[PDB]
Amino acid sequence: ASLRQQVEALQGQVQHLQAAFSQYKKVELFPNGQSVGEKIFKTAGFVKPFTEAQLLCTQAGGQLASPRSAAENAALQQLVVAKNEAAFLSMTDSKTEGKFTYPTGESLVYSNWAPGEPNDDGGSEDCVEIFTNGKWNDRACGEKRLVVCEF
Amino acid sequence: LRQQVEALQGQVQHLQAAFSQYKKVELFPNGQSVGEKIFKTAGFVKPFTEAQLLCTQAGGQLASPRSAAENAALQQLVVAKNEAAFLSMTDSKTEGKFTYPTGESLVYSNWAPGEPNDDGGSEDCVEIFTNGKWNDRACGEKRLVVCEF
Amino acid sequence: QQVEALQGQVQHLQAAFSQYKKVELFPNGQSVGEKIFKTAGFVKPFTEAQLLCTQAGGQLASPRSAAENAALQQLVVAKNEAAFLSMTDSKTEGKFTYPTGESLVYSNWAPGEPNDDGGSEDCVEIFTNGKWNDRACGEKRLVVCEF
Ligand SMILES: C=CCO[C@H]1O[C@H]([C@@H](O)COC(N)=O)[C@@H](O)[C@H](O)[C@@H]1O
Ligand SMILES: C=CCO[C@H]1O[C@H]([C@@H](O)COC(N)=O)[C@@H](O)[C@H](O)[C@@H]1O
Ligand SMILES: C=CCO[C@H]1O[C@H]([C@@H](O)COC(N)=O)[C@@H](O)[C@H](O)[C@@H]1O
Ligand SMILES: [Ca+2]
Ligand SMILES: [Ca+2]
Ligand SMILES: [Ca+2]
Ligand SMILES: [Ca+2]
Ligand SMILES: [Ca+2]
Ligand SMILES: [Ca+2]
Ligand SMILES: [Ca+2]
Ligand SMILES: [Ca+2]
Ligand SMILES: [Ca+2]
Numbered sequence: 001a002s003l004r005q006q007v008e009a010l011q012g013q014v015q016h017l018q019a020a021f022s023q024y025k026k027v028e029l030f031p032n033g034q035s036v037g038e039k040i041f042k043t044a045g046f047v048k049p050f051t052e053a054q055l056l057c058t059q060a061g062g063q064l065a066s067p068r069s070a071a072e073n074a075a076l077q078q079l080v081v082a083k084n085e086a087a088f089l090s091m092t093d094s095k096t097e098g099k100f101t102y103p104t105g106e107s108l109v110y111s112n113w114a115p116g117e118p119n120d121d122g123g124s125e126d127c128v129e130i131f132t133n134g135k136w137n138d139r140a141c142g143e144k145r146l147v148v149c150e151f
Numbered sequence: 152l153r154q155q156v157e158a159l160q161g162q163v164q165h166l167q168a169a170f171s172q173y174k175k176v177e178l179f180p181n182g183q184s185v186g187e188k189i190f191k192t193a194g195f196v197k198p199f200t201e202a203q204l205l206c207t208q209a210g211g212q213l214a215s216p217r218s219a220a221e222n223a224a225l226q227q228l229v230v231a232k233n234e235a236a237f238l239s240m241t242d243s244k245t246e247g248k249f250t251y252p253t254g255e256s257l258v259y260s261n262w263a264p265g266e267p268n269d270d271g272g273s274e275d276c277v278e279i280f281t282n283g284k285w286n287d288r289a290c291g292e293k294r295l296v297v298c299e300f
Numbered sequence: 301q302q303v304e305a306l307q308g309q310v311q312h313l314q315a316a317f318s319q320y321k322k323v324e325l326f327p328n329g330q331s332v333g334e335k336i337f338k339t340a341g342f343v344k345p346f347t348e349a350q351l352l353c354t355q356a357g358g359q360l361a362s363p364r365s366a367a368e369n370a371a372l373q374q375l376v377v378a379k380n381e382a383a384f385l386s387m388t389d390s391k392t393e394g395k396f397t398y399p400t401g402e403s404l405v406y407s408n409w410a411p412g413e414p415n416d417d418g419g420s421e422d423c424v425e426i427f428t429n430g431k432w433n434d435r436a437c438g439e440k441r442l443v444v445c446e447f
Pocket of ligand 12: 434
């Protein structure tokens with residue numbers, strides 16, 4: 001008897017939380033975030049060298065942007081376009097030249113290379129930047145690019 | 152069952168406390184909550200058309216204060232950033248008649264003395280000053296972007 | 301089965317909320333224990349910074365342990381701007397207290413501090429190295445609140 005009343009009580013509290021949270025999700029993503037599927041991209045709004053950007057994302061409980069589909073890539077591109085700053089992706093071929101992988105060592109399941117890329121220009125481009133047009137280019141990891149993490 | 156229900160209650164209570172803490176964190180320092188509405192500034196300026204798209208694409212719309220209370224709330228963000236902001240309303244359809252994005256007429260207004268005056272015959276947008284008063288201004292001007300959710 | 305169902309929704313809510321919390325904290329917030337530090341990203345004199353935090357429903361950063369100090373230190377380091385803490389010794393020179401009047405339960409003064417240099421340093425700033433220094437309250441420092 002009393003338990004049925006508690007259940008109905010919990011239903012009302014849960015509905016309130018769901019509604020309140022749905023509103024805050026939109027508020028939170030504006031203007032530096034993008035939701036795509038179950039992934040969320042968020043830019044720090046500034047630029048940093050690869051290693052520093054990687055650390056920022058990992059320490060925050062996530063990792064550098066790792067678009068695994070056209071949909072995620074387009075979502076990420078929106079942030080790049082908004083800030084008008086090419087961003088770093090999480091993938092590199094630092095372990096084995098010519099073989100780009102995710103931080104986990106897994107090979108890419110998606111790529112959107114601009115024509116002729118990756119080309120390891122000057123024999124020293126192991127990181128990846130995404131342009132405002134959504135295309136990718138391998139680039140020197142020492143360069144500073146917009147920091148975007150995924151959660 | 153009771154041991155489970157009591158567990159569920161514990162989870163809901165935890166969520167209520169964590170969510171309340173999170174809301175304060177989110178709103179600091181670029182948002183304002185007033186009633187069921189939330190105003191949040193992007194912290195930068197854009198022309199009207201661009202600011203409007205930014206808000207719509209984010210799932211909301213440009214700041215649309217409908218009462219003295221909401222206007223005061225929005226004013227706080229303007230004062231904080233010390234940058235006048237665009238409101239969502241315009242009289243682009245019918246000169247002399249300002250409306251919300253849906254097309255409805257204003258239910259509240261806080262015009263500065265003599266405004267709106269369509270200065271130069273080309274002011275169809277609205278800006279809110281640090282004093283909270285409104286002034287119709289050229290939509291091509293860049294103002295603080297503030298959306299409501 | 302309503303309990304089972306409702307619990308599924310709640311646990312799905314816990315997952316979504318946990319994800320949004322990490323997103324919220326990047327890159328201007330830091331969580332330590334049940335406390336959350338968040339910087340406004342700009343500087344302000346003590347009084348103004350204090351008002352902002354209280355108006356936001358929190359208070360100025362008040363690290364009460366080495367752990368909390370380390371978390372706050374991350375924000376200062378990331379922003380590369382020293383920040384004001386909530387404590388002052390305005391009521392009784394030499395005795396720093398929290399807004400509530402309670403005396404410190406933790407401190408991390410840099411060597412030689414607090415020295416009330418100039419005869420008027422009643423506020424506290426935390427450097428990028430995590431150490432504290434008493435400073436004039438009229439100076440502008442990074443605004444960091446705790447919730
Ligand atoms: C941007 C268009 C030119 O793009 C050329 O040069 C880029 C960098 O080498 C430029 O770096 C510097 N320091 O100039 C290469 O990544 C790219 O594949 C192409 O070979
Ligand atoms: C003290 C303020 C004067 O304000 C005058 O001029 C404003 C703009 O036209 C200024 O535009 C530019 N470009 O300066 C009008 O909105 C306002 O109603 C008044 O007529
Ligand atoms: C970075 C640590 C140096 O800290 C030195 O300088 C501080 C302020 O005087 C700095 O302010 C200005 N305007 O120079 C003193 O409070 C502190 O005891 C020490 O003498
Ligand atoms: Ca290589
Ligand atoms: Ca390479
Ligand atoms: Ca290249
Ligand atoms: Ca007109
Ligand atoms: Ca007009
Ligand atoms: Ca006017
Ligand atoms: Ca004193
Ligand atoms: Ca003193
Ligand atoms: Ca000192």
